[PDB]
Structures are given as C-alpha cells and as structure tokens.
Write a protein that binds this ligand. Structure first.
Ligand code: NAG
Lengths: 49, 49
C-alpha cells in the first residue's frame, strides 16, 4: 500500500503543508493576542488601589 | 598450484535492500544527486518535503 501511495505523493505533501500552515497560524494567533507587550510587568506587593 | 602470483587489484561487494530513494535530474537528463530515504532524520525530512 505504501508503494501504491508513493505515486500519488504530491497529494499528502499538499495536505501536510496545509496542516502545518494551520498550526503555525494557531501559534501566530496566540502570540498576536497575548504578546501585545514584551516588558513583563508584575504587580506591586502593596494593593493600595 | 603454487607457481603463480596475483597482481594488485580490489573489489567490494554490498547487498541491495528494498529502500526508497529521491533522485535529481539535471537539464541534460542525467542524475546529479540522490537522497537515501530513512537513513538519518535529516534525509528523512528531505524525503518527506
Ligand atoms: C549539457 O550538455 C551541453 C552540451 O555542450 C553542455 O554544454 C552542458 O555543460 C551540459 N550541462 C551539464 C550540467 O553538464
């Protein structure tokens, strides 16, 4: 079956390319939402707000 | 049986095995380079991509 699938080849190369693009896009989405800033601020010990 | 000498010559013997290969053809139709699939992970990635 692998030998027979060999002569298709380009089809699941295309599929893997598409899925990798999707995964990279997911990481991009999370970064662009949450990594708006880069200075990791932290709260002061005193909560005198 | 003994009155003889052998000149300097050499040969090597390697056994074929069922494998997958990637081959590149130049513009004149001849092969220039190839990749043994399933040798090392780098070659495996060349093979998949
Ligand atoms: C292909 O054939 C032509 C004929 O002269 C030659 O000039 C050229 O160098 C060859 N190309 C390669 C990559 O060997």
């Amino acid at each position: 079956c692998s030998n027979l699938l060999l002569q298709y080849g380009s089809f699941c190369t295309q599929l893997n390319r598409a899925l990798t693009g999707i995964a990279v896009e997911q990481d991009k989405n999370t970064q662009e939402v949450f990594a708006q800033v880069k200075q990791i601020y932290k709260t002061p010990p005193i909560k005198d707000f | 049986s003994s009155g003889w000498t052998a000149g300097a010559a050499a040969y090597y013997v390697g056994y074929l095995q069922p494998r997958t290969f990637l081959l590149k053809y130049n513009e004149n139709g001849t092969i220039t380079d190839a990749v043994d699939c399933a040798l090392d992970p780098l070659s495996e990635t060349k093979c998949t991509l």
